[PDB]
């Protein structure tokens, strides 16, 4: 048992082995402010760099959301569905990892965190914890500014860790605004109610949908708006032509101010508590070793604020839930195995000889994992509960003779 | 489609006009933005 | 459904039939066309 303790303190820990699906999804996280214009341009550039790899066959870049509730992504985040050529076409010494290394090294633009995860792996990770990356961090709080200050520290300490490739934290108030601070006095002057003014904001400046045409089954949206020119920039809005109810020609800045601001981009509401997620993409190291190192870097180089609560969700969260249920499982497995031996031979300490024959079996198991270069996981875990049931089976038939 | 600046720059310098966003983003991350504010 | 032009194009030039290539709710047209040349 002592000689097996070496392969023990040498292997890494993970939740489940990285299963190999035929494809993989590109998720890139970028600062909140990006616009549909530059986002769609940023997208195509990304796809051209993906397709440039001799291994991929198709690429399906998709920024924003699809027509369904199952897709609540913003125009700032992207989900491209990459298809790799048949496994019988990859270059010579190519492996899944050796491909992902060329993808995360070929496809990369300034201010962009690159994440590469399998289709199904991802879509399931997001339904259990929410995080799209294997390693996730949740900074909960009741003061938006505060939790952001914590995500910014925790973010920059994540890139100093040995195995992390690209870590980014989504800002909670990194959105831009152009406020139309109406002036009841200035407007009442021209005899206009707030609503009267606002109509220009929604319909004249914005593309407010007014109605829908009908052609058979299908539907069509109709909208009102000044040519894009009258709404190019803020200044243009300050001189936004308004025809008051009293046929007086004025500018919008005659019934309001317009000031630029910085505020909420999208409020994440996990259990009513506002929260920011920090996406970490480390593939070289083993999961548990990374998160543990992340737990140190964050602990030492970040002083928490009052209402701030940092957490380590992601796949690591699913591992702690299992490791607490399994550590309570061995006793069961050891008292059930202890009595099925207590029944067949009826002898006391004799059943203690067979049940005490599995520790040496577990020993042999770990050695193989180390040599086979495997990570301890819920996959390997079962392999010892089912292996322990066999060491007991044997344990009896070696006492029968 | 063109702005005027009361001050801050000097005729001759070059400024990014296309891709400004992602650029300034990485510039925000590398702390370059905070380093810029801590010099004055 | 057909506008007449006074100057800018020559008889025969190919022209795409789509203003449907720029997101209506604000792709600064001026800068959304600059993305198509270099």
């Amino acid at each position: 048992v002592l000689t097996v303790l070496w392969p023990l303190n040498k292997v890494g820990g993970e939740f489940l082995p990285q299963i190999n699906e035929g494809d993989l999804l590109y998720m890139p996280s970028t600062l909140p402010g990006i616009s549909a214009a530059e986002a769609a341009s940023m997208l195509q550039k990304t796809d051209k760099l993906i397709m440039s790899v001799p291994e991929v066959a198709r690429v399906f870049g998709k920024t924003g959301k699809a027509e369904t509730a199952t897709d609540s992504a913003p125009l700032e985040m992207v989900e491209t569905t990459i298809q790799l050529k048949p496994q019988e076409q990859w270059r010579p010494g190519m492996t899944m990892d050796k491909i992902i290394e060329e993808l995360d090294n070929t496809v990369r633009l300034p201010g962009l965190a690159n994440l590469w995860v399998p289709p199904i792996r991802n879509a399931i990770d997001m339904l259990s914890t929410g995080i799209k990356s294997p390693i996730g961090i949740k900074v909960s709080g009741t003061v938006l500014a505060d939790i952001d200050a914590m995500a910014e520290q925790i973010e920059e300490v994540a890139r100093t860790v040995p195995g992390v490739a690209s870590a980014l934290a989504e800002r909670l108030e990194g959105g831009r605004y152009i406020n139309v601070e109406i002036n009841r006095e200035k407007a009442a002057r021209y005899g206009m109610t707030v609503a009267d003014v606002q109509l220009f904001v929604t319909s004249a400046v914005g593309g407010a949908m007014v109605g829908e045409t009908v052609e058979g089954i299908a539907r069509y949206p109709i909208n009102l708006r000044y040519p894009q020119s009258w709404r190019d920039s803020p200044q243009a809005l300050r001189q936004l032509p308004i025809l008051t109810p009293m046929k007086q020609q004025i500018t919008l800045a005659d019934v309001a101010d317009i000031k630029v601001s910085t505020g909420p981009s999208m409020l994440k509401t996990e259990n009513a508590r506002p929260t920011s997620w920090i996406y970490i993409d480390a593939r070289d190291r083993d999961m548990v070793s990374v998160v543990h190192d992340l737990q140190k870097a964050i602990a030492e180089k970040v002083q928490l604020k009052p209402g701030t609560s940092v957490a380590f969700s992601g796949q690591f969260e699913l591992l702690e839930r299992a490791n607490h249920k399994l550590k309570l499982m061995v006793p069961m497995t050891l008292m059930i195995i202890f009595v099925l031996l207590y029944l067949a031979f009826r002898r006391v300490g004799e059943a203690l000889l067979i049940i005490s024959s599995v520790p040496f079996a577990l020993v042999g198991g770990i050695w193989l994992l180390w040599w086979m270069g495997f990570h301890l996981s819920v996959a390997t875990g079962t392999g010892f509960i089912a292996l322990a049931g066999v060491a007991a089976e044997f344990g009896v038939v070696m006492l029968m003779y | 489609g063109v702005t005027a600046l009361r001050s801050g720059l000097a005729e001759g310098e070059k400024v990014v006009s296309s891709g400004l966003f992602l650029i300034d983003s990485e510039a925000n991350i590398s702390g370059a933005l905070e380093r810029m504010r801590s010099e004055s | 459904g057909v506008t007449a032009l006074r100057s800018g194009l020559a008889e025969g030039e190919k022209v795409v039939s789509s203003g449907l290539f720029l997101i209506d709710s604000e792709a600064n047209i001026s800068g959304a066309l600059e993305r198509m040349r270099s």
Partner: peptide, 26 residues
């Protein structure tokens, strides 16, 4: 060192464009 260096091959993929600061009437 105030500023941020960027891999020239990355920026060129982004297709960055630059303009010169001129002084005159708006």
């Amino acid at each position: 060192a105030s500023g941020v260096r960027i891999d020239p091959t990355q920026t060129q993929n982004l297709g960055v464009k630059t303009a010169t600061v001129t002084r005159g009437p708006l």
